[PDB]
Amino acid sequence: HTAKAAEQGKHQSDKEKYERQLVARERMIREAAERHEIRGYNGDLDDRRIAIFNERIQKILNDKRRELERLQEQKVAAERDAIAQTVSELNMINSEIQEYLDRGGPSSLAANQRAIANLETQMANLEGEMRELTVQINKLNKEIDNSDAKKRN
Amino acid sequence: HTAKAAEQGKHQSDKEKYERQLVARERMIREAAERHEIRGYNGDLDDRR
Amino acid sequence: PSSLAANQRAIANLETQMANLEGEMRELTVQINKLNKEIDNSDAKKRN
């Protein structure tokens, strides 16, 4: 129980860092929408807002690529690099979140917690059994000690 | 004790992922050496290298 | 590594007091059983 409770703490920390990934991603996209003047994501983003933001940032990258051609720009190159680094910033955090989901994530946490609750139940039952068995053994010892005097009696 | 073991498991997993980060860096430097054509790093190397 | 080392050091210490406490529990359990037996025996021994 102690060993697997330490193991459960491990996955609890995993759940904590999953919270950290989600919060960092959601706040970073909110800030990047304002930075890039990309609308529709000022508030909290669910699955669709993030997807449309990714589509729009790729569209912005393509628009910068198109604009570079008619010039053919240094500020355009800096903007393109900013878009690329923002995209990568989205990318590794999204990869972390999806990888967390791949191995099971919350399902693994639930499975770990179920075993915690179960084992706590069996130890509680075992301690109770130890109590009544201790009572019975004490009764048996008293019975023997009495039974000596009972043979005399 | 149960709680303490829980956060110690957290800390041990943290050390484990730190080890994973070190291993990933050591693996990535050798692979990047071939792409960048930088001699002396394709093979085995240490933290000084 | 310093924080993890402190954590495992604290666990080792705590387990040390846990073993000490459990040993005290066994010793005092033996003493208490002896005391109860002595109480019943003395209840007989007043008459004796």
From Swiss-Prot, chain C:
This is DNA repair protein RAD50. Belongs to the SMC family. RAD50 subfamily. The gene is RAD50. It is found in: Nucleus; Chromosome. It comes from Chaetomium thermophilum (strain DSM 1495 / CBS 144.50 / IMI 039719) (Thermochaetoides thermophila). The zinc-hook, which separates the large intramolecular coiled coil regions, contains 2 Cys residues that coordinate one molecule of zinc with the help of the 2 Cys residues of the zinc-hook of another RAD50 molecule, thereby forming a V-shaped homodimer. The two heads of the homodimer, which constitute the ATP-binding domain, interact with the MRE11 homodimer. The lineage of its organism: Eukaryota, Fungi, Dikarya, Ascomycota, Pezizomycotina. It comes from the Eukaryota. Component of the MRN complex, which plays a central role in double-strand break (DSB) repair, DNA recombination, maintenance of telomere integrity and meiosis. The MRN complex is involved in the repair of DNA double-strand breaks (DSBs) via homologous recombination (HR), an error-free mechanism which primarily occurs during S and G2 phases. The complex (1) mediates the end resection of damaged DNA, which generates proper single-stranded DNA, a key initial steps in HR, and is (2) required for the recruitment of other repair factors and efficient activation of ATM and ATR upon DNA damage. Component of the MRN complex composed of two heterodimers RAD50 and MRE11 associated with a single NBS1.
